[PDB]
Amino acid sequence: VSTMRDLRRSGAISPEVSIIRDIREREFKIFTDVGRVYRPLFIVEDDESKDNKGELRITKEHIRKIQQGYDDDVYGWSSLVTSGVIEYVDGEEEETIMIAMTPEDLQTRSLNDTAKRIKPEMSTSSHHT
Amino acid sequence: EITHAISSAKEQVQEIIYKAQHNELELKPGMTLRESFEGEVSRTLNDAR
Amino acid sequence: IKLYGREDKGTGRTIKATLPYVKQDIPIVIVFRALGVVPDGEILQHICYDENDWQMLEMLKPCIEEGFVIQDKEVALDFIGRRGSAALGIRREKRIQYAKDILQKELLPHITQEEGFETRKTFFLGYMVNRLLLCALERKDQDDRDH
Amino acid sequence: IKQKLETQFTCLFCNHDNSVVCTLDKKNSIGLLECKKCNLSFQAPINSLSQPIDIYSDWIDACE
Amino acid sequence: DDTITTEDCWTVISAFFEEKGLVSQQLDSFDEFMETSIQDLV
Amino acid sequence: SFRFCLECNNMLYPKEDKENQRLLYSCRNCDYTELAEDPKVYRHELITNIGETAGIVDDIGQDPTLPRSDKECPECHSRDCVFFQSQQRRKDTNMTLFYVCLNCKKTFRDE
Amino acid sequence: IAFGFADRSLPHFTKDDFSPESKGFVENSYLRGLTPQEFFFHAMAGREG
Amino acid sequence: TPALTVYLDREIALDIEKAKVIQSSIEYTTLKNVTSATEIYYDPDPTSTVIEEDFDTVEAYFSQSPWLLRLELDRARMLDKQLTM
Ligand SMILES: [Zn+2]
Ligand SMILES: [Zn+2]
Numbered sequence A: 001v002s003t004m005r006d007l008r009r010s011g012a013i014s015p016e017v018s019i020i021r022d023i024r025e026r027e028f029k030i031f032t033d034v035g036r037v038y039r040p041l042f043i044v045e046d047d048e049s050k051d052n053k054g055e056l057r058i059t060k061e062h063i064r065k066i067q068q069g070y071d072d073d074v075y076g077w078s079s080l081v082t083s084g085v086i087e088y089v090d091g092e093e094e095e096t097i098m099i100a101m102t103p104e105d106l107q108t109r110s111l112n113d114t115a116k117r118i119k120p121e122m123s124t125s126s127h128h129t
Numbered sequence B: 001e002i003t004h005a006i007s008s009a010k011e012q013v014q015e016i017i018y019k020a021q022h023n024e025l026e027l028k029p030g031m032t033l034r035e036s037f038e039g040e041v042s043r044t045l046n047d048a049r
Numbered sequence C: 001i002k003l004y005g006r007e008d009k010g011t012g013r014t015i016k017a018t019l020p021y022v023k024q025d026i027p028i029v030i031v032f033r034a035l036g037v038v039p040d041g042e043i044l045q046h047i048c049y050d051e052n053d054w055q056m057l058e059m060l061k062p063c064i065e066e067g068f069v070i071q072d073k074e075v076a077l078d079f080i081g082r083r084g085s086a087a088l089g090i091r092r093e094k095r096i097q098y099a100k101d102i103l104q105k106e107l108l109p110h111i112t113q114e115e116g117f118e119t120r121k122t123f124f125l126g127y128m129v130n131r132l133l134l135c136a137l138e139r140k141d142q143d144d145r146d147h
Numbered sequence D: 001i002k003q004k005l006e007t008q009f010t011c012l013f014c015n016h017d018n019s020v021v022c023t024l025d026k027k028n029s030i031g032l033l034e035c036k037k038c039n040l041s042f043q044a045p046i047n048s049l050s051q052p053i054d055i056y057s058d059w060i061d062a063c064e
Numbered sequence E: 001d002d003t004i005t006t007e008d009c010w011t012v013i014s015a016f017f018e019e020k021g022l023v024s025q026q027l028d029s030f031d032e033f034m035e036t037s038i039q040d041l042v
Numbered sequence F: 001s002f003r004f005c006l007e008c009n010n011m012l013y014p015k016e017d018k019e020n021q022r023l024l025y026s027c028r029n030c031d032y033t034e035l036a037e038d039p040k041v042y043r044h045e046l047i048t049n050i051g052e053t054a055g056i057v058d059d060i061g062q063d064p065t066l067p068r069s070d071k072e073c074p075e076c077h078s079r080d081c082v083f084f085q086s087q088q089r090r091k092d093t094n095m096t097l098f099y100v101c102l103n104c105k106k107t108f109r110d111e
Numbered sequence G: 001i002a003f004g005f006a007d008r009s010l011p012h013f014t015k016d017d018f019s020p021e022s023k024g025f026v027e028n029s030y031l032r033g034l035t036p037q038e039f040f041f042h043a044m045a046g047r048e049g
Numbered sequence H: 001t002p003a004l005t006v007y008l009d010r011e012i013a014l015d016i017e018k019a020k021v022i023q024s025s026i027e028y029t030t031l032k033n034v035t036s037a038t039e040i041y042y043d044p045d046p047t048s049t050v051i052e053e054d055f056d057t058v059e060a061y062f063s064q065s066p067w068l069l070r071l072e073l074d075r076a077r078m079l080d081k082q083l084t085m
């Protein structure tokens, strides 16, 4: 699955393909069907083989090239998808992933402003991945 | 005051989960464990608000 | 694929399937034999992948006995053709060859439709029965139609 | 209990259609075809799953 | 490097709509029908 | 575990040998017969617990959606596991948790 | 709120989480503003009405 | 939701112990409700048993078909419902 996942993140396989590992039922399902509804998400580095871990793969360098329109030796949305920083997930693959709501939730923090809203405690699991 | 009463209610719900998962929860008449569990949590949260 | 038998009602709790263009429900074992895999021991080796699971094996018990007397491929294929919405009087010499089309095509056509590939349909059929019994054994919730 | 059923099959001998009656005795696994016209009779074994089309099929093969 | 800010998120989103717009699922679907699907149906 | 004839692959049925007064396992398509190792022929569990623990797979720790705990493994004493309540879908099922050590894959509880 | 995903209410939570925030307790007031998770749950209850 | 409202005689209604007696007599209990497991053995010798577990039970107690029907009662449900063997 790691190899297959990396083929989608580079462009060798069409980015709209779904790669779904259901570990509990011991089933691995792949869909190239027409008509699946999907949405894009930022990819978070999950491999414990680099200092990159726990952070967003996308950086201001990509953001820099987006505003310019060109690489430093057209560069738009689909350029990001075939460079492994954004991927598409559909409803079936969404079942097997863990999504942070905002970039700030990727890292733990150090308030008491009685006007502003309370952020959830999230104390049922000790460490989220 | 408002924030404290909600904070303490979340703790009691934690205690209920602990009791139910360690077989220390009273069963309500006519109800299975999961019904009794769901029932007690709902009463706590509506009284908290 | 329908599982008959209510809770302590329905006596023999067997399983019959429904095939396109056939008027009546046909027991599972019969269609397994009709595809070219006939001894019991191979049939159960295609469905259940856990020889210890006696609860699942006990539920397949009545299905074997209600389809025991159909002991070879030819009488199985003919049992099918005698129900499949055709005309009256196509004789055994051909009523088999009409049912072989209803099995090769129309039945699971998404897997394949070329000849000599009946191993894929037999293996897939076993998967279905396996999934059917997991829900009946309360080991897996029924599917959520709105997912 | 025996089942006496009329069918829409054609007799293989007299050719009268809608005149073949099927008597299926499941207690003894014996099925019986009868012609309401020329009066012929044909016996064949039946199981529990059989229907008038099962023995009428066996009658077509018993002739040929 | 540094952290992705709220303004940076909208830069990414701007690139999406610049390329795809709002009705691309209508247009791409029909385009695939004229290029290929008609031919296959024949 | 119910078995099949080693020469015909059809299923064996239990039948008594009246003359020698012993239990046999007989076939139904041929003459093969063999001796029964177990006097028990059938069991029906009304109050059952089977499949509670069953789904223990080797890659359950690769699933990042599972919550993680601090519980000490009895075998290797690792500080890293996944846990989950019972996968039994009965309505009266308990809510007690199963923990799986990612090293030896043993299943324990909090009782 | 039911587990419409497999053993969880939304993909932003871990499985088998029965805490208040996981099963639809909206802690904030309308004045304070709702968080994104709370928002969807509120829209589920509202739709049913 | 069919339901009965069963008022009790006054002398019984103010004594919780007597009311529990009434409770157990009204409540339907089948054999299926208290049975945990059933078994079918081949026990050919009527005066003995291959089962080592029921050895001391049947041997001392005793001091037709070879097929045996052996059913087990759950101790907890039998104790709560106040039923004797
Ligand atoms: Zn005639
Ligand atoms: Zn044999």
Ligand SMILES: [Zn+2]
Residues within 6 Å of the ligand: F073, F075, F076, F077, F078, F101, F102, F103, F104, F105, F106
């Ligand atoms: Zn370990």
